[PDB]
Structures are given as C-alpha cells and as structure tokens.
Design a protein around this ligand. Structure first.
Ligand code: VRN
Ligand code: ZN
Length: 258
C-alpha cells in the first residue's frame, strides 16, 4: 500500500508515512501576486543549458523523468536567489485529467493545465543524494503550462511516451535540449520549500517563472495516456499527479520583478 495520488493513498494520506508532510516549509503553495514583495536584491536567474546531456526517460509510476548526465559541470542554474551553483539532474511534469487543473503551484488560486519542474542539486554537497539532506540542497525551476499553441521543443518528449507507457519502463533519450521548454522571460517568484512527493524533504529553493509556456491540447492529451500501473496490471491513467497548495506558514514569497 505505497503512496500515490488516489483516494486511499493520495496527498491527504502521505503524513502517516512522511510526517514532514505537515511541516513548516512544504510545497507547493498558492502564490498571492499582491502579497509577493519585489526584492531588488534578487539577481537575474542564470540558466546555462547549452551543454546539457540528456540520457534517458523513465516512467517511475508517478510521472516521467527526463534524466541528465550530471557527472560533469554542464547544465547549471545559478544567480537569482541562489548562492553557488546547482546542476541539472532531471525534469518532469505534473498534469491534470482536464485542462482546468494539473499545476502544483497556483497563482492567485489559478490552476494551470500542467507544471514543468527542472530539478538541480547544489554542487557544494557533491551529489544528489547528499544534497537532499540539506536545507539549500536543491533548486527546482517551475514553469507553468497552458493549452494553446504547440511547444515545438516539447514534441520529442511527447513522441517517446508511447515507449514508456507503464511504471518501470525506460527509453534512451539522448540529445534533448531543455532550452526548448523555457518561456521568453525569466521573471520569477521564489520561496523556501520542499519536494512535492514523498519523501517531502524540506531541501528546495523554489524558483517559479511568471510566464507560462503554451503547449497544444494534443501534447497534453498524450501525457494523459501514460499509466501509473506496471505492464500487465489494471490500467490506471497517469492523470492528476499534482499535490494541492500547502499552508505558507512563516514564509515570504519574493518577486524578481516589479
Ligand atoms: C530523495 C531522493 C532524491 C530526490 C527525489 C525527488 C526529487 C524531486 C521530486 O519531485 S519535485 N516535484 O519535488 O521536484 C520527487 C522526488 C522523489 C524521489 C526523491 C529521491 C528518493 C531517494 C533520493 O535520493
Ligand atoms: Zn515536480
């Protein structure tokens, strides 16, 4: 009886195995745009993905992860609210059963159709596993998806999903350029938070871009054909793999922009 997104194992059950679920810096949150304070001390974000080397795409039973070779200092996030340098290890999405929900963060309670997370680990902790034990171990860049025009840079991801339909399937996925998933503007909100799935570790500096990307209805419909279940198990469509907004508690959301 492992965690998931269903009635019996979903977000409102996670605290039993992961008591930090009710902790002081849980994610995601609602971003109240009027209460978020402009911080002129925040730097422009530095997103350096020119040398990013993707290796593989994996259906892990709760999402699909596009994994990167992080053996060298290549694809790095720095600046913005960050001290030091954070290395890209994977990206994944959260999405809905319908276009009207799917994002984890919300903006003045607005839910987007989906949300992209680019996960980076702080190089001062040597690897991904040690970094998640530290309050500044990860930086996750969050990008909202709305349904409209297709995102050409997403189609290579959409087209491989047929080959990883079920939990535990992986496929070679080399030479994928994540620069094709970024909006024009790097304006952002930032706050200290957590992983949004178990083990819900409070190790993340969240950086959430203001500008959504547009994807087509057909692109997000193909996300919704994936399966939570393994091959030869009862088919459970991989939809609504988002955690709802959690209490902000003693936190401030800062804006990079006026
Ligand atoms: C803690 C973790 C690294 C981070 C992993 C992670 C990262 C992001 C994530 O999603 S999110 N939405 O917080 O970016 C989920 C998970 C669950 C498995 C987690 C892994 C389990 C063992 C390990 O080393
Ligand atoms: Zn995520």
């Amino acid at each position: 009886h492992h965690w998931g997104y269903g009635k019996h194992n979903g977000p409102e059950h996670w605290h039993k195995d992961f008591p930090i679920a009710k902790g002081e810096r849980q994610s995601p949150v609602d971003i109240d745009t009027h209460t978020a304070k402009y911080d002129p001390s925040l730097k422009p974000l530095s997103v350096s993905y020119d040398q990013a080397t993707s290796l593989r795409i994996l259906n892990n039973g709760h999402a699909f992860n596009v994994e990167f070779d992080d053996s060298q200092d290549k694809a790095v996030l720095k600046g913005g609210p960050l001290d030091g340098t954070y290395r890209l290890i994977q990206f994944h999405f959260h999405w809905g059963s319908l276009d009207g929900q799917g994002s984890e963060h919300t903006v003045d309670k607005k839910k987007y159709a989906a949300e992209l997370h680019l996960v980076h680990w702080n190089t001062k902790y040597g690897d991904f596993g040690k970094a998640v034990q530290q309050p500044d171990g990860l930086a996750v860049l969050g990008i909202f998806l709305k349904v409209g025009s297709a995102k050409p840079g997403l189609q290579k991801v959409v087209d491989v999903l047929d080959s990883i339909k079920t939990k535990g399937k992986s496929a070679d996925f080399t030479n994928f350029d994540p620069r094709g998933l970024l909006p024009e503007s790097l304006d952002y909100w930032t706050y200290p938070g957590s992983l949004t799935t178990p083990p819900l570790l409070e190790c993340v500096t969240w950086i959430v871009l203001k500008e959504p990307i547009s994807v087509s209805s057909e692109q997000v419909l193909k996300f919704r054909k994936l399966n939570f279940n393994g091959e030869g198990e009862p088919e459970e469509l991989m939809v609504d793999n988002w955690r709802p907004a959690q209490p902000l508690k003693n936190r401030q959301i800062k804006a990079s922009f006026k």
